[PDB]
Amino acid sequence: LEEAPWPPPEGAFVGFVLSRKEPMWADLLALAAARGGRVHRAPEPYKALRDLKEARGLLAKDLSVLALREGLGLPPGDDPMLLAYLLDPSNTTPEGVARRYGGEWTEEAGERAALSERLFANLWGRLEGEERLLWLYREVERPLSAVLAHMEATGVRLDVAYLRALSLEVAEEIARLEAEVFRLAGHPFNLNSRDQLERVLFDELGLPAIGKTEKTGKRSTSAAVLEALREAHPIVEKILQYRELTKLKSTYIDPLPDLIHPRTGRLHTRFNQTATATGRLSSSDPNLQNIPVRTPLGQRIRRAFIAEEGWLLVALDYSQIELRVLAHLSGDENLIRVFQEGRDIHTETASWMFGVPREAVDPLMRRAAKTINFGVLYGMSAHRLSQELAIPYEEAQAFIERYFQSFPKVRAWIEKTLEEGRRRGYVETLFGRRRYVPDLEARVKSVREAAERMAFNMPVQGTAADLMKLAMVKLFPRLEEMGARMLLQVHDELVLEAPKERAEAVARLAKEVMEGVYPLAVPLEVEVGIGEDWLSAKE
DNA sequence: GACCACGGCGCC
DNA sequence: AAGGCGCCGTGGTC
Ligand SMILES: CC1(C)C=C(C#Cc2cn([C@H]3C[C@H](O)[C@@H](COP(=O)(O)OP(=O)(O)OP(=O)(O)O)O3)c(=O)[nH]c2=O)C(C)(C)N1O
Ligand SMILES: [Mg+2]
Numbered sequence: 066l067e068e069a070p071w072p073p074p075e076g077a078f079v080g081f082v083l084s085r086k087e088p089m090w091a092d093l094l095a096l097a098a099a100r101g102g103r104v105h106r107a108p109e110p111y112k113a114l115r116d117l118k119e120a121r122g123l124l125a126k127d128l129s130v131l132a133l134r135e136g137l138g139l140p141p142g143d144d145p146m147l148l149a150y151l152l153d154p155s156n157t158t159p160e161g162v163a164r165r166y167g168g169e170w171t172e173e174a175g176e177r178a179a180l181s182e183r184l185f186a187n188l189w190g191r192l193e194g195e196e197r198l199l200w201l202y203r204e205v206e207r208p209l210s211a212v213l214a215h216m217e218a219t220g221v222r223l224d225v226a227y228l229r230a231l232s233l234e235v236a237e238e239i240a241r242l243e244a245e246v247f248r249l250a251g252h253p254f255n256l257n258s259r260d261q262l263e264r265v266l267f268d269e270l271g272l273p274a275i276g277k278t279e280k281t282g283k284r285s286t287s288a289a290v291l292e293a294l295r296e297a298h299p300i301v302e303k304i305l306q307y308r309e310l311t312k313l314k315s316t317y318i319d320p321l322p323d324l325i326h327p328r329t330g331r332l333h334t335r336f337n338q339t340a341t342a343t344g345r346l347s348s349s350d351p352n353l354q355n356i357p358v359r360t361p362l363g364q365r366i367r368r369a370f371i372a373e374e375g376w377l378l379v380a381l382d383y384s385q386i387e388l389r390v391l392a393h394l395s396g397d398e399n400l401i402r403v404f405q406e407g408r409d410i411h412t413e414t415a416s417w418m419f420g421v422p423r424e425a426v427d428p429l430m431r432r433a434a435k436t437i438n439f440g441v442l443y444g445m446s447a448h449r450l451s452q453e454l455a456i457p458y459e460e461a462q463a464f465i466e467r468y469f470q471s472f473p474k475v476r477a478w479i480e481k482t483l484e485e486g487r488r489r490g491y492v493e494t495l496f497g498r499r500r501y502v503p504d505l506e507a508r509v510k511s512v513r514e515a516a517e518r519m520a521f522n523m524p525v526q527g528t529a530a531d532l533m534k535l536a537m538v539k540l541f542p543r544l545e546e547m548g549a550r551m552l553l554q555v556h557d558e559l560v561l562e563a564p565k566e567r568a569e570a571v572a573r574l575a576k577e578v579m580e581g582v583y584p585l586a587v588p589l590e591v592e593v594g595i596g597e598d599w600l601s602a603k604e
Numbered sequence: 605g606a607c608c609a610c611g612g613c614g615c616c
Numbered sequence: 617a618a619g620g621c622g623c624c625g626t627g628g629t630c
């Protein structure tokens with residue numbers, strides 16, 4: 066409350082105002098610090114950064130990232146957002162956390178510093194009692210924020226000249242597709258407008274509508290509808306292709322080259338640390354956790370992500386991670402037995418599906434099986450199965466049934482997990498990360514059963530996220546020792562960059578750290594690839 | 605301009 | 617009604 070001259074005493078909390086939300090791109094407008102009942106406003110923010118030992122307060126990682134951009138090794142420390150998010154993962158914004166735990170998120174640095182201190186006191190008290198949440202804070206989230214700050218500030222190289230050239234190629238293909246669509250429709254229209262497309266497909270052409278949209282009840286034109294309609298009229302396939310090319314061009318090919326930072330010549334995402342219900346990170350501005358890889362054009366975009374000249378990318382991927390976690394949480398003996406004997410479930414399902422042997426399973430088979438074991442696992446109705454393979458029932462009941470007959474303890478674990486969630490109001494990961502799911506007790510079946518699929522999924526997806534975050538915290542100092550860089554995390558994958566002659570040693574070490582992160586009832590196995598670009602590194 | 609809801613869709 | 621995200625264009629408001 067009392068104005069004191071900059072600089073603040075050790076241990077102060079910082080408030081700061083940025084000209085924009087992305088710290089790699091922002092001007093530091095103001096900087097203050099609060100300790101006891103004094104607030105210190107720095108006359109020259111940038112200068113003032115130099116006097117700090119660490120960035121401590123709301124959104125600390127943001128300031129640390131900016132400091133790193135200016136060549137200061139200023140790490141983030143305590144952040145009330147991380148405390149709030151461990152207490153309840155619905156705590157995602159400083160606005161929400163302040164309203165809930167005792168202040169108001171304003172636009173003034175001194176008020177943000179004082180808010181940071183107050184909220185930290187109140188949240189610390191709430192979190193002190195909780196051994197496992199405290200453990201997650203001090204051993205996972207708080208150090209992870211320093212790791213993320215360095216990843217953000219470091220960035221990842223992009224082959225711009227390559228993408229500009231790809232843009233023109235795809236633009237000309239898009240022209241061929243839309244002209245062909247307009248010819249079949251008998252007139253031009255805005256093919257990007259799904260309202261205009263709806264009228265053309267179902268009113269002008271005689272195509273049958275298959276589904277309706279959720280909020281406004283229009284006849285849907287989604288890929289799923291179109292796919293069911295593909296053999297009904299030639300325009301449909303053209304539209305599917307048009308949709309793919311314009312999606313990839315508008316979201317990746319065109320924007321990415323314009324996001325290259327002028328000082329680094331790289332792409333700098335944001336790793337949002339308090340943004341998901343399950344404990345996963347999210348990525349934005351740009352999102353680098355959803356770069357294409359599935360289709361041919363998608364792979365071509367993936368190739369644009371490259372190593373520094375003289376370095377290589379190293380991509381590490383936990384194998385069947387959520388199934389391994391499921392084996393451990395449930396203690397199902399058959400499941401555990403599959404991984405203990407180095408077997409592959411996705412492969413075996415692909416086998417089963419395509420009428421093929423284990424030894425023969427195109428990777429496209431596997432990828433198809435992947436979202437089927439996960440789909441089924443997480444409450445996919447026998448119904449929607451029908452429209453993944455073919456004719457039910459008992460072809461779908463007995464598929465979802467054989468699935469659970471194989472691993473009976475899983476059903477038990479699910480019911481057990483739901484029951485505890487109803488009584489306690491929350492579920493939790495292996496490490497005690499929790500998610501409150503109040504709708505487990507809803508008296509409307511569709512709402513309640515949606516709640517249930519969210520609830521029993523969280524311990525599985527959340528444990529895998531705990532495991533990866535813990536692996537990042539352990540791995541990071543080893544990397545800097547070896548002169549390598551951690552660049553990206555994509556949920557259960559890590560992408561590193563290393564000097565060519567160190568690349569294999571780094572891969573090898575990183576793989577071992579990730580597999581031994583926290584021994585379970587089943588081994589964790591990590592596939593690793595090395596390449597000059599992200600695509601070739603994932604093999 | 606900036607923002608919104610919606611439908612749609614990229615990845616894990 | 618598989619789970620978890622963030623981003624895009626359209627159509628419209630302000
Ligand atoms: C876009 C792309 C390529 C990605 C897809 C997906 C997905 C999905 C991923 N996951 C969850 C569960 C997973 O454990 C964890 C990580 O998932 P992957 O690494 O892709 O699998 P996994 O590690 O099991 O096996 P590998 O041995 O790595 O192969 O995240 C899901 O719950 N649903 C999915 O559809 C599908 C198949 C839809 N795709 O076409
Ligand atoms: Mg994986």
Ligand SMILES: [Mg+2]
Pocket residue numbers: 382557558
């Ligand atoms: Mg993966």
